[PDB]
Every structure is written in structure tokens, then in C-alpha cells.
Amino acid sequence: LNMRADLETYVFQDNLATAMRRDGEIYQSIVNDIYDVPRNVTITLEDG
Amino acid sequence: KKPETPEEQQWLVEAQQAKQGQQDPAMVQAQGVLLQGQAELAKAQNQT
Prior knowledge:
The structure is cut from a larger assembly and holds two copies of chain A.
Chain A: H1 2-18
């Protein structure tokens, strides 16, 4: 429980120093088209 | 299962309808070994 408390402050400490490190994996970058922003998310449209 | 889109989307939905399209002729084709016995009824009418 205290280990999980250390891991609770892990995200609120490490991410500042190292930079970034938002979780998950989502298409935002080059190699074909970019971003994911417009409207609703959708099945294989908007950036294709 | 249906798509939960964990890191992949385009390949899921594409091959989903394609796999379902393979199932329909395949089950009927599986009867092909027993179609030999059904062909005896066809040959029975052919010889006459």
C-alpha cells in the first residue's frame, strides 16, 4: 500500500524531470498522416 | 469480441468482414467428402 503510494507520486515527480511520458499509445506522428484531433474518433477516416 | 482498438484498428475491421466471408462457403465445402455419397444419387439419375 505504501509502495503504491510511492508509485502514486512517481507520476507526479518523474514526468516533470524526465519530461513528458503521458501513458497509452495513440497515432499523432508522421509516417503517413499526422494527429488525431478533428471531431469524433472514427474507423479509418479523417486522416485515414 | 468486436474492436477495442488497443493499438490497431484498420487491420481489425478489414479482415473481420473478410474472415466472416470465408466461413460461409467453407462450412458447405466441408460437406464435400459426404458429397461423394450425394453424387451417387446424381449418377443414379444420370445412368437412367
